């Protein structure tokens, strides 16, 4: 975490790529099309900031006993001159490390976890309820406004569904790696002979985004024809352009209407339908987008877990990274800040 | 180019009036205005 942060950042890698930036940089090769220039210095600052990183490390490493003299001498100034450059250091130590992780699209949004009990029927419905209390307490004590969306207390035990809001900053970026399958091994409190069975669950997580609903269509967005309606009407139907036709060029969807004898009221009913059928293509694409934001995994059956929890052998093995703690009880109650970082490191690794 | 209100767009553009028509000439052709 603190002592380890360095390595997994391109600690030795970056400091070699860094000069590759400035590499092609100099020698203005007919600087025509603007491209690297942008991500030229910004990618550079990253570099020599691994020194500010080894300075806040050294200033924080030369700080291990950087108070051995303050354990022998309390009053002075030659000992309060580097300190105003040491308090700020223990700050960036965290900064240049968690500002390298959360470094992705939209995380600072309020999150929305969802818990659905996988296999194991009733066990899973309960193990689900426990997984609920977990993030809750966590996010709760973590300084996050927690709003309960849903809670469907299933059949015999536990729940069937749960969805809650995570009001705060980077709430999503935090409770994001959690998204996935969570297994639970322990003798079934439900089973008869307190036998040993395995439980599964699903925990989805997504950023809060859409709040409004706007669907207005510019005139040029469409096209309106008018022709003589087909049907009864004697001279009328014959010599009037009562029949309308709205066509939305982009989608190609078109609507026709000869309902009433008024070209006018028919345009009205027309668009009225057109809109309706436009929101349907608007919501059809409004969800094929946000649903591809759930993932591409989680069959919620066996062998899909990404971190199991055991209680009759006290431990918690995170399959994703390999990490394995020995305090299931602590994890299931808040303790997460450990596996959350790591969870990211693993992930953000490929981007 | 062609329009109702023909005005100036530079410090370099004369309001020439040739053939009853109010044209506008500048160094850069993008400012060539006429009235109609």
């Amino acid at each position: 975490l603190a002592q380890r942060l360095e390595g997994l950042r391109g600690y030795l890698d970056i400091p070699q790529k860094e000069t590759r930036l400035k590499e092609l940089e100099r020698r203005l090769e007919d600087p025509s099309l603007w491209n690297d220039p942008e991500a030229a210095r910004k990618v550079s600052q990253e570099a020599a900031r691994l020194r500010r990183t080894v300075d806040t490390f050294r200033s924080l490493e030369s700080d291990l006993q950087g108070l051995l003299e303050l354990m022998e001498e309390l009053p002075a100034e030659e000992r309060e001159a580097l300190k105003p450059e040491l308090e700020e250091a223990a700050k960036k130590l965290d900064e240049l490390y968690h500002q390298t992780l959360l470094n992705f699209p939209h995380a600072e949004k309020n999150a929305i976890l969802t818990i659905q009990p996988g296999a194991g029927g009733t066990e899973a419905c309960d193990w689900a309820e426990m997984l609920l209390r977990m993030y809750t307490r966590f996010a709760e004590r973590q300084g996050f406004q927690v709003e309960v969306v849903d809670l469907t207390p299933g059949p015999e035990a536990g729940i069937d569904y749960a969805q809650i809001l995570v009001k705060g900053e980077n709430a999503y970026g935090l409770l994001s790696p959690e998204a996935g399958v969570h297994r639970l091994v322990r003798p079934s409190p439900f089973d008869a002979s307190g036998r040993r069975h395995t439980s599964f669950a699903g925990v989805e997580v997504i950023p809060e985004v859409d709040e409004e609903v706007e669907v207005v269509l510019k005139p040029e967005e469409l096209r309106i024809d008018v022709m003589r309606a087909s049907g009864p009407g004697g001279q009328g139907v014959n010599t009037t352009d009562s029949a309308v036709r709205v066509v939305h060029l982009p989608t190609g969807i078109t609507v026709t209407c000869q309902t009433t004898r008024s070209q006018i009221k028919n345009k009205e009913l027309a668009l009225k339908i057109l809109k309706a059928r436009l929101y349907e293509l608007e919501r059809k694409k409004r969800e094929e987008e946000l649903k591809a934001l759930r993932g591409e995994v989680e069959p919620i059956e066996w062998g899909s877990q990404i971190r199991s929890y055991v209680l009759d052998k006290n431990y918690v093995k995170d399959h994703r990274t390999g990490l394995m703690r020995h305090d299931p009880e602590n994890v299931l109650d808040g303790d997460l800040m450990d596996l959350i970082w790591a969870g990211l490191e693993w992930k953000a690794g490929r981007r | 180019k062609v329009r109702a209100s023909v005005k100036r767009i530079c410090d370099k553009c004369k309001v020439i009036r040739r053939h009853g028509r109010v044209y506008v000439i500048c160094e850069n052709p993008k400012h060539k205005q006429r009235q109609g």
Partner: protein, 140 residues
């Protein structure tokens, strides 16, 4: 501000110097040595101090040069003079920090060899103004 022939002025810090971002292409584009300068520079920076020396370098075909050093921007001497990291964003109203009719005069002495106004009131003026230039009111 003398003769001209493919010159390229620019400011630099203490001994720290060579990163392409600040300098690097800054003079390498007009064909030159980041070598005969990265050190040749820290030959006078290490001697006078470790702040920000406005060094304008001229260039010739022999990738040659004449890096003339001057006093740090009047904007630096004025900062630390009141303990301010940045400038102030929007001056003219918020005086993040302040300086005295004298503290300003001091600096004036430090940059008077660069200006063109012997007088110490004349110089101090174009400094007291440098305050309204970054939101740092003058005490007086």
């Amino acid at each position: 501000m003398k003769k001209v022939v493919a010159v390229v002025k620019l400011q630099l810090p203490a001994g720290k110097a060579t990163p392409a971002p600040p300098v690097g292409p800054a003079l390498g584009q007009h064909g030159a040595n980041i070598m005969e300068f990265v050190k040749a520079f820290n030959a006078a920076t290490a001697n006078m101090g470790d702040a920000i020396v406005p060094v304008e370098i001229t260039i010739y075909a022999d990738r040659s040069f004449t890096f003339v050093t001057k006093t740090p921007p009047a904007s630096y001497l004025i900062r630390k003079a009141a303990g301010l990291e940045k400038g102030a964003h929007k001056p003219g109203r918020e005086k993040v920090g302040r300086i005295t009719w004298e503290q300003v005069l001091e600096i004036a002495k430090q940059k008077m060899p660069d200006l063109n106004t012997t007088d110490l009131e004349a110089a101090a003026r174009m400094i007291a103004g440098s305050a309204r230039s970054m939101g740092v009111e003058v005490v007086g």
